[PDB]
Symmetry: D3
Subunit: 146 residues, 6 copies
Amino acid sequence: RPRMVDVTEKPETFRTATAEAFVELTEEALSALEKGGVGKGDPLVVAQLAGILAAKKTADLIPLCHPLPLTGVEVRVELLKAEKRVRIEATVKTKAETGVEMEAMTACAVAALTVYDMLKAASKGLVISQVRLLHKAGGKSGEWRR
Amino acid sequence: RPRMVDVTEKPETFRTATAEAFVELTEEALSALEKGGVGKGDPLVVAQLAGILAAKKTADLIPLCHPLPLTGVEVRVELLKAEKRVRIEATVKTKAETGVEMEAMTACAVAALTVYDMLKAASKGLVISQVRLLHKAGGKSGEWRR
Amino acid sequence: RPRMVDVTEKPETFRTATAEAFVELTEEALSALEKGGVGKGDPLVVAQLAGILAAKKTADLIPLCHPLPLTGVEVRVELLKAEKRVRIEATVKTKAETGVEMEAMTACAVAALTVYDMLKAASKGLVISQVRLLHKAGGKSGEWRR
Amino acid sequence: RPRMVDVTEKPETFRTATAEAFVELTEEALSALEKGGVGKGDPLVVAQLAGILAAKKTADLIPLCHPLPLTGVEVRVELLKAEKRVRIEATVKTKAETGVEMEAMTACAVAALTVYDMLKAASKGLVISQVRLLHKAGGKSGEWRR
Amino acid sequence: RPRMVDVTEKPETFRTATAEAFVELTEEALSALEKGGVGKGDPLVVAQLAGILAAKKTADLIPLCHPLPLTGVEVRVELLKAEKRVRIEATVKTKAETGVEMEAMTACAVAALTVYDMLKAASKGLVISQVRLLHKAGGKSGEWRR
Amino acid sequence: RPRMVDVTEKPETFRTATAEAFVELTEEALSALEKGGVGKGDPLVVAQLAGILAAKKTADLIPLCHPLPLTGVEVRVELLKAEKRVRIEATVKTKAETGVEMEAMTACAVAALTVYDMLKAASKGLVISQVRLLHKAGGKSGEWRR
């Protein structure tokens, strides 16, 4: 049966996690982003904040996730014109008995969903691709790198 | 500036949206899923419910999204062994002045994040790929299909 | 698999539901309630409000529950000295395609949990008993009475 | 006792509400806002989005408030240099049996709190003043104007 | 007046709490549970997860409850055929200045409410009985047992 | 770009913050408060609890705010008849790497909004004035007093 793994006996150590996500753009969507949106606000700006908010809401969205007080959240949402791609990166930090991989992953996922929300009016077919972990530190397994 | 588009004058019509997401599995992750998990519960079962819950929480996660009472939510999380892939599909329905594309997309995204959460212990490199809309009906633009 | 039953085709009708719950008191707990609490506030007052708030949060707590805009919520938390019992009753109303039995039941459950929270300092053994539905109207099954 | 007034019998009509709030700035705070902040982001931008989000969260914050699906939310956060004041205005709309005065008021209050949050590093004494309703339409009382 | 008791000066110690709840079944409800439900999913499975989620949401539901990061949550929802009863048990753990009795109690209460939600279609009269604390450790009062 | 300032390296120290807010009353509103309200419950009582709840929800409302476990929350909502004013004061405490000024400010703001909610039926023009910080301790800047 499902369970929130017990980590009460484990010590409180410094944890960090970094993830990224991408939104593939059509020419119509790119044109829209280079102008500030399509009558609704700047998608990149709104998405960046949605990511930070999402990081804090992670334990509420992921069933078995441990609720943790976050000590740091950085989110970047930038347009890569030549690649016709929007790249989202998020780094979360804390001092706990469990990692913050889910917080970083969720921040990127929701920021990507927000980019989609504000560009779907012009392109409903936009795809969110490659939500993945890039790095993490802390824990017994130690440092991990993609 | 950002804004929740005014749709007060628009009529209350039947809306529907269907999206999907994929989690690419390593052999280690697949082996884990074919046994029910790695000491934490069945990832597919927990993820399916997380998707339904996420659909209802959509307006809270997406800044400019319209809060709507949902009349239907279906989520499926199945293992595709040969493809070493987990496929998530979600269909949301309602009667409103705006669509539920975000609810379907968010349900798939969070279900995928939950699959990742429960398999990351064995494979931190698992990737969430192709969160995308498959269909939607209702609205002026009418029926849309990928 | 679990699913939020589709009721999009069903008409929007007037629904109502009434439930109740009881907290059995020890002499120590009763004595505390007859004085306004044990250094923390009036349990009956705080619990009554917790019930109203809980009714609105129902869809977030019950996985397959339909999110609905509530049009009415009444909660009563009264002390029955002779019976050494606290009786909670809640009636919820709305216009929807599904009932509000869960909203009434949840309001009573959380109000009871709040009574417990503020009296557990003196009596950790207090029991919440008989959370049950008393009545409901609306829907195909029509009127129901215990 | 407190109660969420029953309005189930009332018809679903178009409602609107507009409110405003002000943040009085010190010279130190003004100087900070004219540069984009003090190492944390643009206070006006973050506050504007916080207001929209807050409007949707209103029923969760105000105990007896009726949960309603919002059909429109507009928030503006502008700097009034000469007056050394930040003015926040918010207009909310919906179709319901109750008004959205609380949604407009809460949107302004939280946007103001966010402006404070991002400028308190330089000026902890900043004051939020005059959160007040400016207009509302719909309901039996009809149109109201300050 | 109500207040969240100040425990800032108290040390951060290991706390644990265990509670249980019961749902009394009619023959109709039992028959339904022995088949996996009545067209909506397995009540026992969905309820078990609802309990874990509820434990994390406890401070949001109980007014004066202290917000705490949980380090462990275990919930079990089993069918007791002979007794025509569903037994829910939940154990919560953490390191804090206050106990987690409310988290254990709330987890059981919401799991029970979820069992009711998915069986009320066949039996609206099902009763939730005996939500009660079984054990707790940590704190000045020390170990407690029912 | 906006960011939740990293304070992971900072030590966990005792923090405190006190804020206040005022609601200016018309004679109609004052008369209503001296009787317990206008058919909806006691505004002062409901508002006081809304403030405590709001303090716990602060990080969810303020975008860049750090999520923290609160160890103490005190809120007072009193009527000042001669001044025709309702005064709200709130003191929040915790042990963290950041302050709780936002929690104190938000508690006062929401309590004030609740007072408004329950008196707006008789006076829609009521104004919330002077939400401001009165004191705070902890942090490098040390003790601060208005």
